[PDB]
Design an enzyme around this catalytic site. Structure first.
Site, PDB file in Angstrom:
ATOM      1  N   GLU A 169       0.870  -0.910  -0.306  1.00 52.12           N
ATOM      2  CA  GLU A 169      -0.131   0.091  -0.044  1.00 52.12           C
ATOM      3  C   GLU A 169       0.845   1.163   0.026  1.00 52.12           C
ATOM      4  O   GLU A 169       1.781   1.425   0.958  1.00 52.12           O
ATOM      5  CB  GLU A 169      -0.807   0.127   1.251  1.00 52.12           C
ATOM      6  CG  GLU A 169      -1.831   1.254   1.209  1.00 52.12           C
ATOM      7  CD  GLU A 169      -1.529   2.463   2.330  1.00 52.12           C
ATOM      8  OE1 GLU A 169      -1.634   2.094   3.251  1.00 52.12           O
ATOM      9  OE2 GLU A 169      -0.966   3.395   1.446  1.00 52.12           O
TER      10      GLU A 169
ATOM     11  N   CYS B 229      -1.618   8.403   4.318  1.00 50.17           N
ATOM     12  CA  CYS B 229      -1.777   7.863   3.184  1.00 50.17           C
ATOM     13  C   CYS B 229      -3.328   8.531   2.579  1.00 50.17           C
ATOM     14  O   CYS B 229      -3.405   8.400   1.452  1.00 50.17           O
ATOM     15  CB  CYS B 229      -1.788   6.457   3.289  1.00 50.17           C
ATOM     16  SG  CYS B 229      -2.348   5.582   4.615  1.00 50.17           S
TER      17      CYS B 229
HETATM   18  O1  LIG Z   1      -6.527   6.741   7.915  1.00 52.84           O
HETATM   19  C1  LIG Z   1      -6.911   5.518   7.612  1.00 52.84           C
HETATM   20  O2  LIG Z   1      -8.177   5.228   6.848  1.00 52.84           O
HETATM   21  C2  LIG Z   1      -6.571   4.294   8.189  1.00 52.84           C
HETATM   22  C3  LIG Z   1      -5.980   3.242   7.124  1.00 52.84           C
HETATM   23  C4  LIG Z   1      -4.483   2.937   7.303  1.00 52.84           C
HETATM   24  O3  LIG Z   1      -4.537   1.658   8.251  1.00 52.84           O
HETATM   25  C5  LIG Z   1      -4.029   3.948   8.475  1.00 52.84           C
HETATM   26  N1  LIG Z   1      -5.413   4.588   9.069  1.00 52.84           N
END
Ligand SMILES: O=C(O)[C@H]1C[C@H](O)CN1
Ligand SMILES: NC(=O)c1ccc[n+]([C@@H]2O[C@H](COP(=O)([O-])OP(=O)(O)OC[C@H]3O[C@@H](n4cnc5c(N)ncnc54)[C@H](O)[C@@H]3O)[C@@H](O)[C@H]2O)c1
Ligand SMILES: NC(=O)c1ccc[n+]([C@@H]2O[C@H](COP(=O)([O-])OP(=O)(O)OC[C@H]3O[C@@H](n4cnc5c(N)ncnc54)[C@H](O)[C@@H]3O)[C@@H](O)[C@H]2O)c1
Ligand SMILES: O=C(O)[C@H]1C[C@H](O)CN1
Ligand SMILES: O=C(O)[C@H]1C[C@H](O)CN1
Ligand SMILES: O=C(O)[C@H]1C[C@H](O)CN1
Lengths: 523, 527
Positions: free
Chosen positions: B286, B320
Site C-alpha cells: 500500500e 496515506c
Molecule cells: O486513515 C485511515 O483510513 C486508516 C487506514 C490505515 O490503516 C491507517 N489508518
C-alpha cells in the site's frame, strides 16, 4: 450449482450417436478462424495451421497471427467497452456464463468434444471430462462464487452504511492458454470477464479449433462485443505487446515456467509505464509423484498409475511421471505394469473408441519426448522396461514408455517431459522415511502427488512430510483428474502462484474492491 | 467460530482512569531513551550501526537508541526463522489466533497507556490520533484477522463418494519480509502479525521513526505467547534490508507499506532474482495517495469545513488517506473560504504530551520538514498558487509546520498531483456548470487511487460522482472525510499507484498469506 455429470457414451446412447455425427462432420474439414476484435473478423497475412495430432495431413484449422498493430487496436476497443461491462450487476454477467454452460451441456456438447478430439488428439472420455465437464463446471461454479462474493459486505454502524463494490481491474487482462485443456482456455479468459474485466485471449495454436468454438458459444450466450478479444498471435509478439501497454492490469497464464518468468520480468521492467500494478497468475506444471508404501493395494497402484501417467499421452500438468515403489512390492507392480502396458491401445481416437490414448500434440513435443527416450537409452542408471518406440509418419505417435531408474535424482526424475514417459525408482522397504524425503527434495515443483498406503500412521506421516511437495495431494487415488468445487487446483514451488481455480477464492484475483462509506448525519 | 467487535475509543476526559494512566506513561517517557536491540529468537543483538529515534516535537529528546542489523544478522535471522517455520505452520490456526487475541487484550487494557504514550512521544501523535491507531486499529487488526483466519478453515470443498476432500491453509514456504511505515503503529503490527497468524515466519524491519512504539508491540506479542523465531525484530538500513531479503532463495513474500518508488524497487529486485527462489514471492504494497474532497453546490458547508480540516491536518496530514486537494464550486467558495480561514485560525499546533488541546504537532523528521518547506516555497513562487493561510515553519525545537491552505488557479499544478505528506491543502475552485468536466479532472489529474470524498445532498449527483470516481478511490466517502477507515467497516486500500489493494481490514487480506493444499482421500479401491 452441482457438478456436470460425466456421460458414459455407451453403445446406442444419445451422446455417443451425437458425438459420432459431430466427428463425421469434422473428418475432412478445415475451419478458417479469424481474429475477432469486437464483432469484426480480421485476417492478417501471417497465416498458420492447426494440424490433427494423429493425422497431421489434416489441417483442422487455418488461422492467423495478430500483429502488434492489431493487438493494440484490440486493447483500445476492449478498454472502451470496459466501464459499461464493469458497471453491470454481477448477476447479469454471470447469466452469460450460465447460458454458455447450458449450451455446452446440451446442444453444443458433441461439437466441443469432437473439436477437442480432432484438434488436440483427445479420446472421447478425455474430451468429455475437459471440454464438457470441467469447462461447464468452471462457468457454473465461478458464477456461483461471484454472486455469493457480492454478499460479503462489511459491518455498518449508524449513522453510516458501508458497501463493498467488487470492481473489475482497471485496464485489460491478457489470457494466455495452453494446448492441453480446452476448459483451461475458457476459464483463463472467462473468469476475469465474469468479474467485470475485459480480456485479450491468445489461445494455444494447437487448440485453436476448440478454443474458437468456446469463444463463439460465449458470444452466442450474450457476451457483448469487445469483452473478450479472440487474438491468436506469436507468443513472444503477444507478450511483448501486452507487457508494453500502459493499460495492462493482469496476466492469466497457464504453461511453462520459463514463459511465466519471462512475462513476470517484462512486467517488472515496465512498472513505470503502467497505470496500476499488474496481477500475474500462473500455473506452470509439475513433476508429479505416486509414492507407494508396502501396505498399498497393488491393483489401485497399477490402474491409477497407468491412467495418471498415460491418459492424454501424459500431457497433463498433473500427470504422474515418477513412481516410488518398495522392493517388497516391485515384482508385483513391475509384472502388472508390463503386462497391462502391452494391452494399451495407441491410435486414432475418432475412428477407434477403444483407443487408450493417441498422438502427442505437435512436432515440437514429439521431438522433445524423443530426446528423453534417447536419454533413457543412453544413461547408465536408466533401463527402458517397456515401450520406447515413436513414429511421426502419420501422426505424432509415441508409445507409452516405462523406465526404471537406479538414481532417484536422475534428470528424468526431475524434469517435466509432458509425454507418456513414466520413471520408477525402487527403494528398500526399511528406507521409506529417507525416500519420502527424496520425494520432497528432488524436484523444483509442487503441483500434484499421491500416496498409496493402507496404514493410517503411514498416511499421516507421509501427509505431514509431503505438505509442500504437492498442492493437490491424493491418498489412494491417482494424481490427475481434479474436479471443480471438489479439488481446487494448483500448487507452489515452481508450479506457479497457486490461485486455486476451481475453488471460491480464485475470482478474488480478478477484482479490486472499493468500499463506499455513506454518512447520513452532519459531521 | 469467534465473536469479535470493534475496540471502543476512549474519551480521556479529565479525571478518567485512562487520562491519568496516559499522563503517567507520558511522564515516564519524558526524559527517557530506550535502548532497543535487534531480536533474533530470544537473543538481544547489538551491531555497531547505532541509530537514534527523535521526538518530532522536541528533537533534542532521543526517545530510542537502536541499531541496524547487518547482513550477517539478517541472514542468521532468516535461517533461524526457517528452522522454526514447519512447527509453527503445523500448529492449529486457533492456537496461533490465541496469541493475537491475547495481545489484543493486553493492548486494550494494561498496555494501552504505554503504546499510546510511545506513539505520541516517538511519532508526534496527539492523544486521539494515538488512541485510534496504536490502540483501536491495532487491536482491531489482531481480533478481526483472528476471526477471519479461524473462519477461513471452515471454507471447505465438496466431497462426493467415494472420496473426502479437505483444504489445508498452509503458510507460505519460506519467510516473509514485513517493512512498515512511520505513520501508524497499527500498520507495523498488522504487516508482521497477519502473515505470522497464517503460519508464516517473518523478518520485521520497522520504521526508524516509529521504533519505540513498534518494539512495544513486538514485546507484547512475545509476552502473549508468540514463540521464538516466528517474528524476528530486525531494524535495518532500508536498502540493505531489501537487498538481503530479495537475494535469499527462501523469500516467499514482502508485506510493505510506504512510498511507491520503494515498492517498485523491491518488485524489480524480486523479478531479477526469480531464478534463485524456491517459489514465486508474493508482494503486497500500500503506497499512499493524493486524495480528494469533491464538493457539490448542494453540500453541507459545515460538514465540508470540519471534515476537510480534519482530513487535511490531523496528524499533520501525514496519512496515506489525508485530503490534499479540495474541489469547491464557485457558488459556495465565499461561504467555504470564510469558514475555512476562521477555523484555521483556531487550530493549535504544539506539544501533544504537554497540551491535550493540541490539534496536531510537528512532522516526523528533518527530511519531511525539508520537503514540506520546499513545497511552501514553491507556493510562494508559482504564479498559479497563493497561500491563503499558514505558510510558516520552524525547526528550532521540533519539526513544526503551520497548517497551510493554498488556492491553485491551475487544476493540473504539480501541487495538485504530488503527495506532500504534510499539512498542506490545495483548493481548486470550479464553475458550478462545469461539475461534470471537473469530476473527470478529479479522476485523471493524479497517479493515485486511494481515498476520496464527495460532499453533496443531491442523490443524483451522488450517484453520478460515485460512477465517475469508481477507480479514483478504493475507499470512497459520501458526506464524510477521507481519513479514518475502521477495521471490519471500511477495509482499506486502493489501486492505480496506491498499490496492490489487498484490503487489510477486510476478510480477504489473509488469503495473500496462505497457499492452500487440497487433500483428496479415496475410500474404495480403484477400478
Ligand atoms: O486513515 C485511515 O483510513 C486508516 C487506514 C490505515 O490503516 C491507517 N489508518
Ligand atoms: O511454451 P509454453 O508451453 O509456455 O506455451 C504456453 C502458452 O504461452 C504462449 N507463449 C509462449 N511464449 C510467450 C510469450 N513470450 N508471451 C506470451 N505468450 C507466450 C504459447 O503460445 C502458449 O499459448
Ligand atoms: O520512505 P518509504 O516510505 O519508502 O519507507 C517505507 C519503509 O520502507 C523502508 N525502505 C526504504 N527503502 C527500502 C528498501 N530498498 N528495501 C526495504 N525497505 C526499504 C523504510 O526504511 C521504511 O521502513
Ligand atoms: O483416458 C481415456 O480415454 C480412458 C481410456 C482408457 O480406458 C483409460 N481411460
Ligand atoms: O488434471 C487435473 O487435475 C485438472 C486440473 C486442470 O484444470 C486440468 N485438469
Ligand atoms: O486529531 C486529533 O487529535 C483531534 C484534535 C482536534 O480536535 C481534531 N481531532
Amino acid at each position: 450449482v452441482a457438478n456436470e455429470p460425466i456421460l458414459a457414451f455407451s453403445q446406442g446412447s444419445p451422446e455417443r450417436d451425437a458425438l459420432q455425427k459431430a466427428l463425421k462432420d469434422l473428418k475432412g474439414q478445415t475451419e478458417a478462424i479469424p481474429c475477432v476484435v469486437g464483432d469484426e473478423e480480421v485476417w492478417t497475412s501471417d497465416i498458420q495451421y492447426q494440424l490433427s495430432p494423429f493425422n497431421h495431413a489434416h489441417k483442422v484449422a487455418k488461422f492467423c497471427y495478430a500483429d502488434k498493430a492489431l493487438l493494440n487496436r484490440a486493447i483500445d476497443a476492449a478498454l472502451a467497452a470496459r466501464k459499461e461491462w464493469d458497471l453491470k450487476p454481477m448477476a447479469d454477467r454471470a447469466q452469460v456464463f450460465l447460458k454458455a454452460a447450458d449450451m455446452l451441456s446440451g446442444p453444443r456438447r458433441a461439437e466441443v468434444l469432437a473439436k477437442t478430439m480432432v484438434g488436440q488428439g483427445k479420446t472421447v472420455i478425455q474430451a468429455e471430462i475437459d471440454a464438457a465437464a470441467e469447462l461447464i463446471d468452471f462457468f457454473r461454479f465461478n458464477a456461483k462464487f461471484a454472486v455469493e462474493l457480492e454478499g460479503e459486505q462489511p459491518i455498518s454502524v449508524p449513522p453510516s452504511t458501508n458497501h463493498t463494490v467488487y470492481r473489475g481491474l482497471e485496464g485489460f487482462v491478457a489470457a494466455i492458454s495452453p494446448f492441453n485443456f480446452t476448459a483451461i482456455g475458457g476459464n483463463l479468459a472467462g473468469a476475469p470477464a465474469l468479474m467485470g474485466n475485459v480480456v485479450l485471449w491468445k489461445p494455444s495454436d494447437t487448440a485453436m479449433l476448440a478454443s474458437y468454438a468456446v469463444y463463439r458459444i460465449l458470444r452466442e450466450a450474450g457476451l457483448p462485443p469487445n469483452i473478450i478479444q479472440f487474438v491468436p498471435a506469436d507468443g513472444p509478439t503477444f507478450g511483448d505487446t501486452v507487457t508494453s501497454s500502459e493499460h495492462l492490469c493482469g496476466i492469466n497464464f497457464t504453461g511453462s515456467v520459463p514463459t511465466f518468468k519471462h512475462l513476470w520480468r517484462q512486467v517488472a521492467q515496465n512498472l513505470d509505464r503502467f497505470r496500476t500494478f499488474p496481477r500475474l497468475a500462473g500455473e506452470c506444471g509439475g513433476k508429479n509423484f505416486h509414492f507407494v508404501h508396502s501396505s498399498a493395494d497393488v491393483d489401485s497402484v497399477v490402474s491409477g498409475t497407468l491412467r495418471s501417467a498415460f491418459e492424454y499421452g501424459g500431457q497433463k500438468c498433473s500427470a504422474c511421471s515418477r513412481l516410488y515403489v518398495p522392493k517388497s512390492l516391485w515384482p508385483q507392480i513391475k509384472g502388472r505394469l508390463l503386462e497391462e502396458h502391452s494391452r494399451i491401445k495407441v491410435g486414432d481416437p475418432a475412428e477407434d473408441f477403444g483407443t487408450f490414448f493417441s498422438a502427442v500434440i505437435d512436432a515440437k513435443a514429439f521431438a522433445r519426448i524423443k530426446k528423453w527416450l534417447e536419454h533413457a537409452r543412453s544413461s547408465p542408471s536408466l533401463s527402458i522396461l517397456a515401450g520406447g518406440q515413436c513414429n511421426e509418419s502419420v501422426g505424432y505417435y509415441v508409445e507409452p514408455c516405462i523406465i526404471e531408474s537406479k538414481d532417484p535424482q536422475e534428470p528424468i526424475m526431475k524434469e517435466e517431459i509432458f509425454g507418456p514417459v513414466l520413471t520408477v525408482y525402487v527403494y528398500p522397504d526399511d528406507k521409506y522415511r529417507e525416500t519420502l524425503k527424496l520425494v520432497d527434495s528432488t524436484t523444483s515443483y509442487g503441483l500434484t502427488g499421491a500416496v498409496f498406503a493402507q496404514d493410517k500412521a503411514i498416511v499421516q506421516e507421509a501427509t505431514r512430510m509431503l505438505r509442500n511437495a504437492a498442492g493437490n495431494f491424493y491418498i489412494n487415488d491417482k494424481s490427475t483428474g481434479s474436479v471443480v468445487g471438489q479439488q481446487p487446483f494448483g500448487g507452489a514451488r515452481a508450479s506457479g502462484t497457486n490461485d486455486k481455480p476451481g475453488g471460491p477464492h480464485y475470482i478474488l484475483r480478478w477484482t479490486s474492491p472499493q468500499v463506499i462509506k455513506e454518512t447520513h448525519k452532519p459531521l
